[PDB]
């Protein structure tokens, strides 16, 4: 390839063809090397020139080459992305969305996706410059299957970045404007379009219940549940994140997930070979057992309590901690008979074994659960029998062991449980 010095000499020539060849040499440098010399290109002052080339409608080749070069600069660090924005790229790329040449319009889509992907400020600045209307207009066809596959994938990914991040969340009216197109993309059968559409939905559902509501009322939950059962891990991961986000909301929002059949997938989610799936699925379960006692009953009816015993028994510790929360929540909201069923499934022994964990919060979660189970036992006339089970699990004397424990917090029930039940 060319040196940066030669690229600079060609771009400074004021000869449009010499500038085109130098811009192509810059794009090859920026797209071929690993460790492309982005900072050298920026320090040479080339970004304003590339941005001006985006406006040369009489030379579509140099529009494409400079769009590609700027895309890759914008894919770098936040400082490198800011250099592109500072050079006036945002409104120049938005104008290029109207190009008659699909390869040029898609490169502008890509560049705006990298700029928006930097964070909420540049995301919102891309929106303020008017990107959403022309982006959605590229998708306004009766059947998405008539669009080129790579083109559609790039549009979906850029739209997902406009749905990105949390502080703040994207403007409400932008979300409302994008959502119908996003729901179309969620139903499009291409694995990468589905993955990125799912990511967008997971972003939009991560936040307050009002944000969750505007997604749920578009009717997407049954489609998320279908995707929750896909074979592609890049689809299952964001679908599960979105389902998990939705059940952090109200009892009605949680009930839509259950009504759609999500619990039938959890036997495989809670045994999934990928640790991050098990953790995410067990966290979602803990927010479902924090629901109404008829929602707990659905967990029971789907046979999921043995799977929670399993995760509590053997799993990555972070997943085991989420399972302890699931149990405490269950014991906290469940009926006496639901708590009896939990004990009959073998919850006591794995729950006692985790009292040896060096994490302090799981000990407090587990001792809350033990407390909740004893009050159920009290209501039945039945307490002493529970106490017997605990000590044969070794759980008794690793409870006393916890009255030394540093926390005033673990101190409470450690003495409470013994004075009130054991001794």
């Amino acid at each position: 390839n060319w040196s940066v010095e030669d690229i600079v000499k060609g771009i400074n020539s004021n000869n449009l063809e010499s500038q085109l060849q130098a811009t192509q040499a810059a794009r090859k440098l920026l797209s071929r090397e690993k460790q492309p010399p982005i900072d050298n290109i920026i320090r040479a002052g080339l970004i304003p020139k590339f941005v001006s080339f985006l406006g040369k409608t009489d030379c579509s080749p140099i529009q494409f080459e400079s769009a590609w070069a700027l895309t890759n600069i914008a894919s770098g660090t936040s400082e490198q992305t800011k250099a592109v924005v500072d050079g006036g790229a945002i409104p120049a790329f938005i104008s290029l969305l109207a190009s008659p040449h699909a390869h040029i319009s898609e490169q502008a889509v890509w560049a705006l996706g990298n700029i928006a992907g930097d964070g909420s400020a540049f995301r919102d600045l891309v929106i303020k410059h008017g990107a959403i209307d022309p982006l959605l207009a590229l998708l306004a066809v009766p059947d998405l299957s008539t669009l080129a596959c790579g083109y559609l994938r790039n549009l979906t990914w850029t739209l997902s970045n406009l749905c990105r991040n949390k502080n703040p969340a994207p403007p409400l009216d932008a979300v409302e404007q994008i959502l119908p197109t996003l729901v179309r993309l969620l139903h499009h059968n291409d694995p990468e379009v589905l993955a990125d559409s799912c990511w967008a939905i997971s972003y939009l559902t991560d936040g307050p219940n009002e944000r969750i509501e505007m997604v749920v009322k578009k009717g997407v939950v049954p489609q998320l549940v279908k995707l929750l059962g896909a074979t592609e891990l890049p689809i299952v991961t964001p679908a599960l994140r979105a389902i998990g986000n939705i059940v952090t909301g109200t009892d009605e929002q949680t009930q839509k997930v259950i009504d759609a059949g999500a619990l039938a997938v959890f036997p495989s989610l809670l045994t999934n070979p990928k640790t991050n799936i098990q953790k995410e699925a067990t966290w979602t379960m803990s927010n479902i057992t924090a629901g109404r006692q008829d929602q707990i009953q659905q967990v029971v009816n789907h046979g999921l309590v043995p799977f929670l015993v399993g995760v509590l028994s053997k799993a990555d510790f972070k997943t085991q901690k989420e399972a302890a929360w699931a149990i405490t929540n269950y014991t906290s909201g469940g009926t006496v008979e639901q708590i009896v069923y939990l004990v009959h499934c073998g919850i006591i022994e794995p729950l006692m074994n985790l009292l040896s964990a060096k994490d302090t919060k799981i000990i407090q979660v587990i001792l809350d659960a033990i407390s909740n189970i004893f009050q159920a036992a009290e209501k039945l006339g039945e307490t002493e029998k529970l106490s017997i089970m605990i000590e044969e699990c070794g759980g008794l004397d690793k409870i006393e062991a916890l009255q030394r424990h540093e926390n005033e917090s673990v101190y409470k029930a450690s003495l409470n449980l013994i004075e009130k039940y054991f001794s």
Partner: peptide, 9 residues
């Protein structure tokens, strides 16, 4: 934690 892609070839 950003989300960006270069175009390679």
């Amino acid at each position: 934690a950003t989300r960006k892609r270069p175009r390679r070839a």
